């Protein structure tokens, strides 16, 4: 039960770039729910959150640009 | 969709009581507002086959109620459709 957001329940915002930093790999990929053990609701929640932050250049798409 | 404000208006016009939101009178009137509201949607897209099914399904339900309503309250029946304008 290695959750984070499941206890601190909230509609996950893309703005928390510090929070989202922990969920992405150094390359820039989205770490799967199999590793973090995050609840599936919050996983898909996180996915849209990341991609919106990705769109606003708050998170890199990859290492080299 | 049938926004909430418009919904309470229709109920308070056909229902025998303010809370009487289950009468056959009301359900036919209710769906009819919705179907007229969807004609604009199916005047632009004309290719959206899935909600086309949505509309088609609710037409048959309207059809079944009038079938029912006729066989039970003949007088009431003619009154209803002249107030809602349909059948042809």
């Amino acid at each position: 039960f290695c959750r984070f957001t499941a206890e601190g329940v909230q509609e996950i915002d893309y703005k928390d770039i510090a929070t989202l930093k922990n969920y992405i790999t150094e390359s820039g990929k989205i770490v799967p729910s199999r590793i973090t053990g995050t609840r599936a609701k919050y996983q898909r929640q996180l996915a849209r959150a990341i991609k919106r932050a990705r769109y606003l250049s708050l998170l890199p798409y990859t290492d080299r640009h | 969709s049938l926004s909430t404000e418009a919904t309470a208006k229709i109920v308070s016009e056909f229902g025998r009581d303010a809370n009487d939101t289950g009468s056959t009178e009301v359900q036919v009137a209710l769906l009819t507002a919705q179907i007229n509201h969807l004609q604009g949607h199916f005047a632009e897209h004309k290719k959206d086959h899935h909600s086309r099914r949505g509309l088609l399904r609710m037409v048959s339900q309207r059809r079944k109620l009038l079938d029912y309503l006729k066989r039970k309250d003949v007088a009431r029946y003619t009154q209803l459709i002249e107030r809602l304008g349909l059948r042809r």
Binding site: K15, Y55, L56, P60 | -
Partner: protein, 100 residues
Amino acid sequence: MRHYEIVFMVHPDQSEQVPGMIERYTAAITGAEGKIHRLEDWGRRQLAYPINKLHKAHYVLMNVEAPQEVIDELETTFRFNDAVIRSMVMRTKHAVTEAS
């Protein structure tokens, strides 16, 4: 009467000219009874990947409430303007405060 969360970038130069920019936008919304809620100017923040040039950028956060007519026209003013880059517009979900 939806709630929107407009977020848009600004090319540095015009960053010098940013307050008047928002002043025009908040006027049109208020012009149609749109209650504004946040106005968090993130300020000149460094990007992650370069947007065609510009290794630096300037953000503006809105979180405004408005009717659908106004918001569609106001979005077009981002399109045809060569200062605003990447304009995001999301949906309601009970408009917030303090957000950062």
